[PDB]
Amino acid sequence: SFASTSGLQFTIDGETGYFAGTNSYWIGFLTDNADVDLVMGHLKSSGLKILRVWGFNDVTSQPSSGTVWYQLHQDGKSTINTGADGLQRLDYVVSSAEQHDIKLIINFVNYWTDYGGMSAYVSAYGGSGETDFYTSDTMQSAYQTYIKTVVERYSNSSAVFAWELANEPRCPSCDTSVLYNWIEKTSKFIKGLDADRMVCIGDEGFGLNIDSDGSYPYQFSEGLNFTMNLDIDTIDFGTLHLYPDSWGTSDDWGNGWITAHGAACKAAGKPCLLEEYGVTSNHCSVEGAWQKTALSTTGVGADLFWQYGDDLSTGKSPDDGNTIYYGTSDYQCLVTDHVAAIGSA
């Protein structure tokens, strides 16, 4: 029925094995159904089985008409948009995913300010910086009511791969227990509402004492401890992201990053998801190597490149330099070849 874990691997539609997928944060904010279906059709014919999307869109005032928004935080209250320019846009993504046999990872808030994020909650509820979000009872109450509304809305759908706490949560210089405690509380809350659906964190994978080279990502300065959080009983698999160019490390360092997380996942007895990765140049050679490493690493059960691209009714989808567009040479290297390789395992 719902997607699950089987040892260090994932199971989808009764098939247990390695899976390739991708990210499209923008799909739930499109307003044209044909574009959503165009994307889902292309993912299906590409063999990409997991699509990670943003399940949040937070604002502190109603946006100009026509702009999609999911939740408004104003006058000390949080209001959820269930209209045509609100959660009905995510509904179409979920429904199209069901039709096209695609499973979705849907997260509930951004650590970053894009689409509001924890900062929009802090603006409305009070405090300073994203870190106050985690321990604020009023913000956690609003965030949990949003979670409940979303989770219950799709309770009868088999297309949700996993509920994810947030995109890239960090707690700079915080004791690792702050995120540990918030992850435990939030994942328990989600499991109470939807016991059979997998839950994951959505973090970058920082804080790792297995085969550390002492570099920034392995250290604990961002408030994260990968092995400690992966032991939470209500977390089903670990997540790691990979951006050497943003972290000041080499491209080859990315393979060790994947290998080390695989070792931690094996030890925890749970799969790891390489949930985001990208570079803005030399896509095929660099990312192809990471893909090979992820596939061959015990403990790593799937990978999603950041990010998918397509030619929509409105022109090409977002290009942040990491985008790999359907039907291009880089797409053949990083999708057609990778999916073929996985199937030839």
Ligand X SMILES: *[C@@H]1O[C@H](CO)[C@@H](O[C@@H]2O[C@H](CO)[C@@H](O)[C@H](O)[C@H]2NC(C)=O)[C@H](O)[C@H]1NC(C)=O
Ligand Y SMILES: *[C@@H]1O[C@H](CO)[C@@H](O)[C@H](O)[C@H]1NC(C)=O
By beta-carbon proximity to ligand Y, the closer residue of 153 and 292 is 153
Rg (CA), the chain: 19
Q: Is 168 a catalytic residue?
A: yes
Part in contact with Cl ion (CB under 5 A); list of ranges 75-83, 139-147, 261-269, 328-336: 328-336
**Under the criterion CB under 6 A, does residue 225 sit at the interface with ligand X?**
yes
Under the binding rule (CB under 6 A), the answer on residue 220 touching ligand X is yes
Residue 227 binds what, of Cl ion, ligand Y, ligand X, none (CB under 5 to 8 Å, by partner type)?
ligand X
Given Cl ion, ligand X, ligand Y, none, residue 329, with its beta carbon under 5 to 8 Å by kind, binds Cl ion
Report which DSSP code applies to 60.
S
First to last CA, the chain: 25
Nearer to Cl ion, 60 or 332 (CB): 332
Q: At what angle do helices 33-46 and 87-100 cross, to 10 degrees?
A: 30
User: Based on CB atoms, which residue is closest to ligand Y, 98 or 184?
Assistant: 98
Identified catalytic residue from 164, 168, 204, 222: 168
Minimum Å gap between C-beta 155 and ligand Y is 5
Confirm or reject binding of residue 141 to ligand Y (CB under 6 A). Answer: no
176 binds ligand X (CB under 6 A): yes
**Cβ–Cβ < 8 Å for 212, 260:** yes
DSSP letter for each residue of 159-218: -EEEEES-BS---TT--HHHHHHHHHHHHHHHHHH-TTSEEE---------SS--S-GGG
Applying CB under 6 A, among 80, 193, 228, 341 the residue interacting with ligand X is 228
CA-CA-CA-CA torsion for 157, 159, 165, 167, nearest 10 degrees? -140
Mention every residue, 6+ apart, whose C-beta is less than 8 A from residue 61.
72, 74
Q: How far apart are CA 271 and CA 8, in angstroms?
A: 4
Range 25-84, binding ligand X (CB under 6 A): none
Residues 236 and 241: their CA atoms lie apart, in Å, by 17
Tell me which DSSP letter residue 110 carries: B
CA distance 42 to 276: 20
Residues 342 and 176: their CA atoms lie apart, in Å, by 36
Q: Which does 141 bind (CB under 5 to 8 A by kind): Cl ion, ligand Y, ligand X, none?
A: none
Number of residues in contact with ligand Y under rule CB under 6 A = 3
- The owner of tokens 């739930």 is 28
CB of 152 to ligand Y, least distance (A): 6
**Closest separation in Å from C-beta 37 to Cl ion:** 24
Q: Say if residue 307 is preceded by a cis peptide, omega within 30 of 0.
A: yes
Name the one range near Cl ion by CB under 5 A: 102-110, 128-136, 168-176, 320-328.
320-328
Our finding on whether 4 is near ligand X (CB under 6 A) is no
225 binds, among ligand Y, ligand X, Cl ion, none (CB under 5 to 8 A by kind): ligand X
Site string for ligand Y, 38-77 (x = CB under 6 A): ----------------------------------------
Amino acid of residue 205:
G
* Residue 154 beta carbon to ligand Y: minimum distance, rounded to whole angstroms: 7
DSSP 16: E
Decide if residue 261 touches ligand X (CB under 6 A). Answer: no
- Tell me if residue 287 is catalytic: no
Q: With binding defined as CB under 6 A, does residue 110 bind ligand X? A: no
Residues designated as active site: 168, 276
Residues making contact with ligand X (CB under 6 A): 176, 209, 220, 225, 227-228
